[PDB]
Amino acid sequence: LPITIDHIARVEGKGGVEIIIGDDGVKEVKLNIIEGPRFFEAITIGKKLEEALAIYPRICSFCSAAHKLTALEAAEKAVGFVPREEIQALREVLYIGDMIESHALHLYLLVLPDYRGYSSPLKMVNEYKREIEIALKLKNLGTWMMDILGSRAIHQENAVLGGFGKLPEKSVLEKMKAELREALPLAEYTFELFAKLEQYSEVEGPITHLAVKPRGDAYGIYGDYIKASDGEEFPSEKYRDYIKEFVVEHSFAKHSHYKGRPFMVGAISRVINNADLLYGKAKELYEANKDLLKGTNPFANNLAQALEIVYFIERAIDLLDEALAKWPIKPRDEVEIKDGFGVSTTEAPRGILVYALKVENGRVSYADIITPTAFNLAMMEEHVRMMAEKHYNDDPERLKILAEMVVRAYDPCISCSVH
Template sequence: MKNLYLPITVDHIARVEGKGGVEIVVGDDGVKEVKLNIIEGPRFFEAITLGKKLDEALAVYPRICSFCSAAHKLTAVEAAEKAIGFTPRDEIQALREVLYIGDMIESHALHLYLLVLPDYMGYSNPLRMVNEYRKEINTALELKNLGSWMMDELGSRAIHQENAVMGGFGKLPDKATLEAMKRKLKEALPKTEYTFDLFAKLEQYEEVEGPVTHLAVKPRRDVYGIYGDVIKASDGNEFPGEDYREHIKEFMVEHSFAKHSHYHGKPFMTGAISRLVNNAGTLYGKARELYEGHKDLLGATNPFANNLAQALELVYFTERAIDLIDEALARWPVKPRDEVALKDGFGVSTTEAPRGILVYALEVRDGKLNYADIITPTAFNLAMMEEHVRMMAEKHYSDDPERLKFLAEMVVRAYDPCISCSVHVARL
């Protein structure tokens, strides 16, 4: 029958955070339309914090997500400090980055082992893998628990951290706890290297090979990391993070409660692979060695490389956290917090959350929040993610529909989306 358009639908993408689906419309002559239907209900975190006292607003933001609550809290705190003209001491910044790395370790371990690996091992969920892949599941839980414990010690709790405040921390763990954290990180290094070796053997589907523009935060001090004030693109362009609105445009699409984003009029990608594409030259240690030996698997043209990039970052950030703890211990005892004076101002923080660039723009007036704009990695990624699902569909639309659904979900999972984070609305 000619011109018969049939939808292939995934109502709920499994093993991702939040509620989203895929709709692929196929006709007799190919793929007609691909939609990532983000149907998580709108959330109003920017709007509900307007008019609140600044510290009260900062306590709300980590509630945006339990997967990356430390990322939200620390990025918001830095934006607020920039707005009021405060710069934290180096040792405070080092310990904040250790807290952020705890988030990175926990999130990457959960994504790789419990969300991605079942696809490759032929299981519908990780619980079914326990008997045959007990080592992998134990490794996932050990790394996850390490990251969670780091956030608990430095952030006062594993999720929705309250201990990171303007001026520093409410309190700091004692020296013995930081030394124990360093020991545990050293013990975890072989597990991170095992993770990299495991994911280096997994397929990266050639169906989605193609040019991709990657954006990442340019790290401070020219050391691969999380914090930076400049956004770097793989097309050679760089711009101050505070100018993000001049280069990245958000726009509404009918099928999604989350906006899509374009960089200079085109979809783009952000995340672990984007950090490597732009900043691999700032790696050091074992991670640098692994990167040099696997460049062919960590290129810019395939979203599935994001999985291996996260595995490489597990190695790197474990080593980096050890060095940052040493940096803080060299100045011990560390005063937890400096007093801050609230002033009117506007500040933008751009950091690297587990899933990519996270932007917070905050304006403070009379000690209260007057303006807030938050853009999350998933909101940045959705347009490119949809394009990669289209590429996969164009290669497999005539296959068994169940096979196409499976491959489409795999593409989405490679991005490690955090759907709930992506659906904010700034105005009621």
């Protein structure tokens, strides 16, 4: 009889993986996603731009500001408008805060209790008070940045094309700078805590890493040219030519392949790709821990997430210091919604998020959504097969919990995979 998980905990979706076995060990791995279809690629077809764009963040909620930022970039590319540098700096601050919140929430709430032997974060309210308190402070910093800029932590609605509905004041931004300064030592604590953590060697192997070239002089989520381990480079609009998508029969979510082979995306897939542009304390930390951050073990994703948290805290401090210069700032820019086409492949805390829109006469005629969860599920299947090949004769509970460990190390957003 096949081994199947009814519901994988601490993962942004409902459903589990199915493992079939025979005389030759594990035969095939079938990820089952009973999360119902949401049709976010079609429910906005023919609808107005402003109405459709505000409901796109509802695909998930761990980083809905990433979805709103990507959608705003796609819309401003289709209309062919580029906001001012201070507006882009503020949107970068919003993106950095939401990436901080998502990565910290993942690393602490979801995967940390499993390594320390806890089923729920409510178990460690007293026996792990320091770590959970630092987790709460980092998550609250992200949430307060979201409430200041995007007006809400979940399902953001302040972000609009051309700027913002109402910017905060100078003292609020200075308090944001002070809070980031205070929280940088907590980010260092998080990086140390995840660096002193072990990684399983039962699944190590060659991995193809996908990322984008940062749109700047240093590491950044904004990017145009997608970069890979083999050095392949292509523009953002040429994503369909290389990455191919198809639908499997064992999950509502779509499937992806690269050069006929599954590929893995994540924090490691960006760090080990283009960490040469890093700066700050994260650069020294990466140089020190380069031995641990090998492009072979998928469990280095958590370490890469923590390192990127620290680096983006430094980048947020720098960006806010730069944005304090351009004061006073107009709230938003207003532009007529002209016909056009545009895409956006801005990076996400989980990987590379692909958004494509085609607006005709102020109404979104065409829209395709590809998410990092669908990007890395293909190699998630390969990794769970590899790790179950070493434990198929072991206890079913132990192989189930190890598969849970590897899938949560992949950091999936299941309801992002099903659009």
